[PDB]
Amino acid sequence: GKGRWLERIGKAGGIIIGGALDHL
């Protein structure tokens, strides 16, 4: 079950590790 593909984390730490994108 590739569920977790969404339960991995989701919250990009308040849109920072995600918003930064590849920590650019």
Nearest Cα residue to 23 out of 6, 13, 9: 13
Cβ neighbors of 12 (< 8 A, separation 6 or more) are 18, 19
Dihedral angle computed from the Cα positions of residues 3, 16, 24 and 10, in that order, rounded to the nearest 10 degrees? 0
Separation CA 15–CA 21 (nearest Å): 10
Separation CA 9–CA 17 (nearest Å): 11
Separation CA 1–CA 7 (nearest Å): 12
Experimental method: NMR
| Tokens 């590849």 -> residue | 22
* Pair 9, 3: CB distance under 8 Å: no
